[PDB]
Structure formats: C-alpha cells, structure tokens
Amino acid sequence: AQYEDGKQYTTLEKPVAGAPQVLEFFSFFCPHCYQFEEVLHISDNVKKKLPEGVKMTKYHVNFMGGDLGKDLTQAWAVAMALGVEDKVTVPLFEGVQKTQTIRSASDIRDVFINAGIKGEEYDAAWNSFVVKSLVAQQEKAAADVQLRGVPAMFVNGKYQLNPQGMDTSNMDVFVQQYADTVKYLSEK
C-alpha cells in the first residue's frame, strides 16, 4: 500500500478508548518541537487538511527539563484555560531554547505578562483547581499512550505518526506528507 503500518505511522497494540481525535504532545525543551512549531508549523498545516468537526488537542509533557519542565506543563495548563496558547507558544520556545532566559517559574510568568495577560489573572489561573485538573489531563493522556518521546501525534488513540519514515530533503514536502498522513489516519 502507499500508507503502511510501520512506515508513516505505527499502531498502538494497546489502543486508547475515548482519546482526543488528534492529539499532539510536545515540550518547550524539545528541539524538534521547536522546529515543528516555528519552522514547520505542523499543527496548523494538519488542521488545514483535517475534515472539520475534528477537534485538535495539544499537550505538554513533564519528562524533559526536570523541575522547569513540570512548571511548563502547569503554565501550558494556564495557557489552555485562558485561551492564550497563540500568544505564548513562541516566546516560551524562544525563552527556553533560543535566548535561555527562562530558568524559573517567575521567568515563565514574565512571558505571559509581556504577552499581556494580567498578573492577577495569571496567578489566579496558576493556582486554580481548574488548572490542576488540566495538568492531570495532560499527564493522564501521556500515561495512557506509553509516551517516552516528543514530538508525538496520535490519531483516535489508535495511530501514532512516524515522521522518521518520511522524506526530509524538503521541509514543505515533509509537512504535506505529515499532514496528509494525519488525514488518511483520520479517515481510517
């Protein structure tokens, strides 16, 4: 076939019921994730080709960057609750991997403040139980799927994108292939 298990994707032998339709995992410490967001815009090109009525979900993970990594998962929870993902993703990535100016929860906070979220609103979000549950969800979803690496995308709790098995000579061709694979898996 043109799409083969073990080539553009792999199948979870332990499928996950009730999982989000399109589920992405990343870390602000993850260098391919940086690429995936800033250079490739994977998520947006996937969305562009997905059917609609398709919910797209993106989660942060704890297993990179120790204490800061966990701080970042709580911050991403804050971002999700406030709906401010698109004003913080880039400065978080650049603060972690480019400029090296994020070293504490307080520096993460600065990114939000500078993006215009109010101190009060941020701290209230940070400490809220809605955010707690939202951290729980991120962790549960990673636990549910054997997650040991990022970036990672899962479709319907059944299929895992396998980017190693796609051509990388051309970034645009890589993205199209990636996104078309998601669409294919989606319709399976």
Question: Nearest 5°: CA angle at 49, between 45 and 55?
Answer: 90
Burial state string for 56-74 with b = 16 or more CB within 10 A and e = fewer than 16: bbbbbbbebbeebbbbbbb
Query: In terms of DSSP H, where are the helices of the chain?
Result: 31-34, 42-49, 66-82, 85-93, 105-114, 119-127, 129-143, 171-187
Burial state string for 149-187 with b = 16 or more CB within 10 A and e = fewer than 16: ebbbbbbbbebbbbbeebeeeeeeebbebbbbbbbbbbe
Question: Three-state SS for 164?
Answer: helix
What share of residues in the chain are helix, strand, coil (percent, to 5)?
55, 10, 35
Query: In terms of DSSP H, where are the helices of 50-101?
Result: 66-82, 85-93
Question: Three-state SS for 110?
Answer: helix
Number of domains in the chain: 1
Q: Which residue matches tokens 């410490």?
A: 29
For residue 45, the one-letter residue type is: N
Resolution for this model in angstroms, one decimal place? 2.2
Technique used by the depositors: X-ray
Q: Give the domain extent around 188.
A: 1-188
Question: Which distant-in-sequence residues (6+ apart) come within 8 Å of 76 by Cβ?
Answer: 59, 60, 85, 138
Of 72, 60, 81, nearest to 125 by C-alpha is 81
CATH number, domain containing residue 187? 3.40.30.10
How many angstroms separate the CA atoms of 62 and 71, rounded? 8
